[PDB]
Symmetry: C3
């Protein structure tokens, strides 16, 4: 039986989309041919800049809209998965899963969130013998270790209750802090008393964790000391040996009822001065290696500290996707939609960004699947190591490619997984410690062409692209529940820095060896449409360079040039109308089949314009500088502020200059002012919030100042 | 109202009186009817949308341009 | 205080408790309460507030909670378990 079904659009919303987009393309082509041939506009430089920027925009739009072609939907059947693979009455036949969590430093983000996500990971609905959690830290701080030690006991207390009462979400903080009616569909007779007792226990655990956090802020001069009375190996961050610890495993503690709990492995890498270590690529790769030694699981589910498991069915749905002999053979990873919480009614920041995750991601799903984003992905272990799809499409060589350790090579040689020796666990711990050595990745192909693609800043998309170029296929599953919910940035500086980082990473990937324009061209195994989508995703920031000039055009056209383009009733106006109606009808029809709110598209496009104005511009300039070689939010806001002021002063001055005329601008003034109004309306709402205390009411004083300044300009014009 | 509104503009300011009377009755009907239809087809009553305003003004240009051309 | 009917004695009791629960040596701080209405309701409210303060002062002074007014403290939606390290606080 088919465990999952993939059905396309019902065709009642797809053929009209195709027809309308083709009509839009034809109209654009005719428009550009007519613009190139007939009009001159009496000015060469201005018209040339306008036409070249418009042509660049047209190329960008045509190369961006095609990937949306052929959207596809999917659904999974956990009932049939359990009916077949569970095999009630006989031992389970479900594949193992290795969850990964990585932390950088406990001071920047409180360890409470890390503990909450660890608990959510440890409280999934999967056989305890299969799921295994791994936690890695780069700071090697004792605060995180103590927090995990306490979280072990709290999980021992919490897991039976959660697994018995089927409560969700599994994260204790994010569950207890819910105003939804907790007694909605619970039939367990003794639920209330257990809930009250568990809430009290959780508050006590919170108090203990807060005490540990407060204590950690004071650093003794002798250095940290453990309870057993031994100096902390991770005293100096730069220099410290790597350490591996096991908790809540078969060897360790057990549940109150006597049932075992999933093993949690705490790994800290070995770092030395003068040794180059990557921010996160060298941590996840080390996690993969140490997991390959400890518990060889065919599937590795990657996550972040902020994001936790919402519903205890994501693992089961991933197994459903990846277990089918037909639709589970060529699958490499199952990307999940990362949804956020804590959103106000006025989502001016547009941090949600679901138009991309729904309209675009699903559209790309049809051809070759989505792109790795950095959270909620079940990678295939063999795919991560690099072997190519099964049934496509020497020992020294194995040493060179994988590493000097022979134990890791022997472990990875097994397709099914698991530990072949199944003995000498302490020796396996020592072997893992050796495998996580600093000098392991010296001349091997680790990261370069095997693991997380080493990159200066951004590597998730690079790794996904590299592993797709080999013939792999990825899936995109959207459960009814998000299943992966995480806290999102709430201020503007963090969002601007994040978008700037994304743009810088994209520019670096474009300028690096792995450039889609001339990479992955041997042996095929990459769809042309997928390559086009990759090009779109890589060279999207470059549109900012023409966008800045284009949005600057109206300010000059309304003051110096005082013209846009001659208007002809027969053909020019008709083409303008065709384009204007086609774009809006296309947007509406696209929104029809995606279930997106109309305001969301407008909010996203204005946010994109803002990012192009400032974030992409600065990122691309920094990219040029870095390539030639071989920032504060206030500085980042200089281009937007300059454009806003220049546009507003230009529009007001030109309005006064047109008023002084004898009603000879009845057409051209409206034509010139419409573009300026469009730009200003897209730009002002963003600047108002950052320079305003609230978005509900900007102010009333600024209106007074604006009217008084208009009076000032009018009086000056009258007097001079 | 929009079609007749434009048809009044083409005239030489001869509808200064008649146009307001005819428009006022239409405005009374629309103002009563519009708020209800907005909510059922809109996601919130606090802010209807900003896109429809863009479409309406662009649609206003649509009729105006057509009238000038025809 | 002027009269207990115009303003409830609960607010006066809360203010008295906040005054009595300051961070200062007990031998120095001294509180004085005056009334113009000479009403017995205020006197009885103060008598009960004496016992309530006897109960409340050690807890507040030991756990360094703020604000000291109980009515204006218990009715706070801010996370009450934010930076408290005392094991037996709950
Ligand atoms: O989400 C996390 C993930 O993000 C990755 O970076 C993504 C980013 O997340 C996306 O938001 C972003 O999507 C934008 C596209 O980059 C951008 O190319 C596109 O530009 C469109 C624009 O949206 C659209 O409005 C515009 O329409 C105009 C026409 O072009 C004009 O011809 C016409 O006149 O007027 C209409 C507007 O009315 O066209 C342009 C394209 O030409 O907008 C998208 C947002 O809506 O893409 C980024 C990557 O591509 C990041 O890489 C990941 O690491 C991260 O995990």
């Amino acid at each position: 039986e088919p465990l999952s079904i993939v059905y396309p659009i019902p065709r009642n919303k797809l053929t009209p989309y195709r027809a309308v987009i083709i009509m839009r393309l034809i109209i654009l082509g005719l428009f550009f041919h007519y613009r190139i041939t007939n009009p001159v506009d009496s000015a060469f430089g201005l018209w040339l800049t306008s036409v070249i920027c418009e042509i660049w925009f047209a190329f960008s739009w045509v190369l961006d809209q095609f990937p949306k072609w052929k959207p596809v939907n999917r659904e999974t059947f956990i009932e049939r998965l359990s009916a077949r693979y569970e095999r009630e009455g006989e031992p389970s036949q479900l594949a193992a899963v290795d969850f990964f969590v990585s932390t950088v430093d406990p001071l920047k983000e409180p360890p409470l969130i890390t503990a909450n996500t660890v608990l959510s990971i440890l409280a999934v609905d999967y056989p305890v013998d299969k799921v295994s959690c791994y936690v890695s830290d780069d700071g090697a701080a004792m605060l995180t270790f103590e927090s995990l030690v306490e979280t072990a006991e709290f999980a021992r207390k919490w897991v039976p209750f959660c697994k018995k009462f089927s409560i969700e979400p599994r994260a204790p903080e994010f569950y207890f802090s819910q105003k939804i009616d907790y007694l909605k569909d619970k039939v367990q007779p003794s639920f209330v008393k257990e809930r009250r007792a568990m809430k009290r226990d959780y508050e006590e655990y919170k108090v203990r964790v807060n005490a540990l956090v407060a204590k950690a802020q004071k650093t003794p001069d002798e250095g940290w000391t453990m309870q057993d009375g031994t100096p902390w190996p991770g005293n100096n961050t730069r220099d410290h040996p790597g350490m591996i610890q096991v908790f809540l495993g078969n060897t360790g503690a057990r549940d109150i009822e006597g049932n075992e709990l999933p093993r949690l492995v705490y790994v800290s890498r070995e770092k030395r001065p003068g040794y180059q270590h990557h921010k996160k690529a060298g941590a996840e790769n080390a996690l993969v290696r140490v997991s390959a030694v400890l518990t060889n699981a065919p599937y590795i589910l990657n996550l972040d500290c902020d994001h936790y498991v919402n519903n205890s069915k994501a693992v089961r749905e991933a197994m459903c996707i990846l277990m089918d002999p037909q639709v589970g053979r060529d699958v490499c990873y199952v990307q999940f939609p990362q949804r956020f919480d804590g959103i106000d009614r006025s989502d001016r920041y547009a941090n949600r960004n679901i138009v991309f995750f729904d309209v675009n991601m699903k559209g790309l799903d049809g051809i070759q699947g989505p792109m790795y984003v950095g959270t909620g992905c079940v990678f295939n272990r063999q795919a991560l190591y690099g072997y190519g799809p099964p049934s496509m499409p020497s020992q020294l060589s194995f040493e060179k490619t994988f590493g000097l350790s022979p134990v890791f090579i022997e472990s990875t040689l097994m397709e099914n997984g698991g530990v072949p020796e199944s003995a000498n666990s302490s020796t396996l711990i020592k072997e893992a410690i050796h495998v996580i050595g600093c000098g392991f990745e010296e001349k091997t192909e680790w990261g370069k062409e095997i693991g997380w693609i080493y990159g200066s800043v951004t590597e998730d998309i690079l790794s996904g692209f590299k592993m797709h170029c080999r013939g792999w296929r990825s899936i995109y599953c959207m459960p009814v529940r998000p299943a992966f919910k995480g806290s999102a940035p709430i201020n503007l500086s963090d969002r601007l820095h994040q978008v700037l980082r994304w743009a810088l990473g994209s520019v670096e990937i474009f300028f690096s060896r792995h450039c889609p324009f001339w990479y992955g061209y041997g042996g095929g195994r990459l769809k042309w449409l997928q390559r086009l989508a990759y090009i779109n995703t890589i060279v999207y920031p470059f549109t900012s360079l023409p966008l800045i000039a284009y949005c600057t055009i109206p300010a000059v056209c309304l003051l110096t040039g005082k013209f846009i383009i001659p208007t002809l009733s027969n053909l020019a106006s008709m083409l303008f109308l065709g384009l204007f109606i086609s774009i809006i009808v296309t947007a509406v029809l696209e929104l029809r089949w995606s279930g997106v709110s109309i305001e969301d598209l407008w909010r996203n496009e204005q946010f994109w314009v803002i990012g192009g104005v400032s974030a992409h511009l600065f990122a691309v300039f920094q990219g040029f500088l870095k390539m030639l070689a071989g920032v504060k939010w206030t500085t980042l806001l200089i281009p937007p502020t300059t454009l806003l002021i220049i546009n507003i002063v230009g529009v007001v001055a030109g309005f006064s200059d047109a008023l002084n005329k004898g009603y000879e601008a009845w057409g051209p003034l409206f034509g010139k002012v419409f573009f300026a109004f469009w730009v200003i309306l897209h730009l002002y709402p963003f600047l108002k919030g950052l320079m305003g205390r609230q978005n509900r009411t900007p102010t009333i004083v600024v209106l007074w100042s604006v009217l008084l300044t208009s009076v000032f300009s009018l009086v000056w014009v009258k007097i001079n």
